[PDB]
Structure 1
Amino acid sequence: LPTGVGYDWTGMSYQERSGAPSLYAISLIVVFLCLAALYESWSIPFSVMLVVPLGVIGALLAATFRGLTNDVYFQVGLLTTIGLSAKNAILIVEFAKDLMDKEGKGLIEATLDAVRMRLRPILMTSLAFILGVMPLVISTGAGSGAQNAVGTGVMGGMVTATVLAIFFVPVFFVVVRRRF
């Protein structure tokens, strides 16, 4: 534009300082650290970590299939699924790495009976949740989007979370625990 003319971003564009996305990068560089306590070794923790997508995929699908976007409301509902899924995984990997140091069992051992013990709680918890959050994946009165944006990212989540957690988590356990 003609010399002497210049520009500035204001309000809805200026915002704000500061402000970076590396928040989650320091979060994830301490969820390692926390587990390195619970599970004795530095090498183990990856067992629960690798879960995290097995959770988002379904939630993303559920949003994309309903045609609703990445809000904050979906974004928090994602974070509840990234933790609920990884909580369940924490119990599986705990029981396993205990019913082999307390009991003193073979290399594969009750990684199975770990998933056995835990399958009853993991199932009825996710049954309750998907059932309690039901009417707020349709509802459609006032907050007909607001409430509807909350459930869809959970619905799709706890669906993908549990129905893959059972399977991939002991894969993640035995793969990694052998590898070192």
Structure 2
Amino acid sequence: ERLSGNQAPSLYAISLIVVFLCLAALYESWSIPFSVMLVVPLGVIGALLAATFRGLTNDVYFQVGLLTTIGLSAKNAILIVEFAKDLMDKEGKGLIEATLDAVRMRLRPILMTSLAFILGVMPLVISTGAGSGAQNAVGTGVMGGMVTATVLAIFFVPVFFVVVRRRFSRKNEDIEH
């Protein structure tokens, strides 16, 4: 190294913190960012399954694809709660009412992107020939991650939000203006 090693935790810890901070500013809230951060695991599980089931390894290619997968599931979660939060705030719509109207408005764009990207990386996962080692490594991580993140997030995000909204509010959950 040697010269020392294992910088991963530090840099991802700070990465985690900056993301929370950016989300705090985005929502003007210290608590709502969690209803987005909680989705991180949802893509990682899939990336881990595919890698393991395929005999792959935790390497550069696996790390970067995961960040990408986390990025997108973060982006989907952010737009969802951004829609739910606005409906409540701008319009009067109450918690549930808005969480469901948002998630429903968000389902399609989410599926369009997931399947476009999952299909897109298929060539990589299917790759043979020069550099297929790298190509396979990149593709299978992203494919696994995108699948779980996609299916899981569309259900878990609306949850994350109401649980978080309820745990850190005052009034309320009823329609209004």
TM, length-normalised to structure 1: 0.88
What is the deviation of 1:18? 6.6
What is the deviation of 1:142? 1.0
Measured in 1, the distance between the counterparts of 2:145 and 2:95 equals: 32
The aligned residue for residue 112 of structure 2 is: 124
What is the deviation of 1:34? 0.4
**Secondary structure of residue in 2 paired with 1:42:** coil
Ranges in structure 1 where 5+ consecutive residues have no aligned partner: 1-14
**Secondary structure of residue in 2 paired with 1:113:** helix
What is the deviation of 1:107? 2.9
What is the deviation of 1:125? 0.5
Determine if contact 2:85/2:98 at 8 Å carries over to the other structure: no
CA RMSD across the alignment: 1.2
Question: 131, 139, 143: which one pairs with 1:143?
Answer: 131
* More off after superposition, 60-69 vs 21-30: 21-30
* More off after superposition, 63-72 vs 107-116: 107-116
Determine if contact 2:24/2:33 at 8 Å carries over to the other structure: yes
Q: Deviations over 1:102-135 (max 9, x none)?
A: 1011232220010011111000111110111111
Aligned residues, how many? 166
The structure whose residues are more often helix, as a share, is: 2
The aligned residue for residue 17 of structure 1 is: 3
**Secondary structure of residue in 2 paired with 1:134:** helix
Question: 116, 122, 131: which one pairs with 1:134?
Answer: 122
Q: Deviations over 1:112-163 (max 9, x none)?
A: 0100111110001111101111111021111121111000110001100110
Determine if contact 2:84/2:99 at 8 Å carries over to the other structure: yes
Q: 1:53 to 1:16 in 2, by over 3 A?
A: same
1:161-180 alignment to 2 at 5 Å?
Answer: 161-180=149-168
Ranges in structure 2 where 5+ consecutive residues have no aligned partner: 169-177
Measured in 1, the distance between the counterparts of 2:27 and 2:145 equals: 26
What is the deviation of 1:99? 1.0
**Structure whose CA Rg is larger:** 1
**Secondary structure of residue in 2 paired with 1:115:** helix
Q: Runs (4+) of structure 1 moved beyond 6 Å?
A: none
Measured in 2, the distance between the counterparts of 1:44 and 1:100 equals: 14
What is the deviation of 1:100? 0.9
Measured in 1, the distance between the counterparts of 2:166 and 2:11 equals: 32
Q: 1:21 to 1:106 in 2, by over 3 A?
A: closer
What is the deviation of 1:40? 1.7
Q: Deviations over 1:42-74 (max 9, x none)?
A: 011100000000000011000001111011001
Determine if contact 2:88/2:94 at 8 Å carries over to the other structure: yes
What is the deviation of 1:27? 1.1
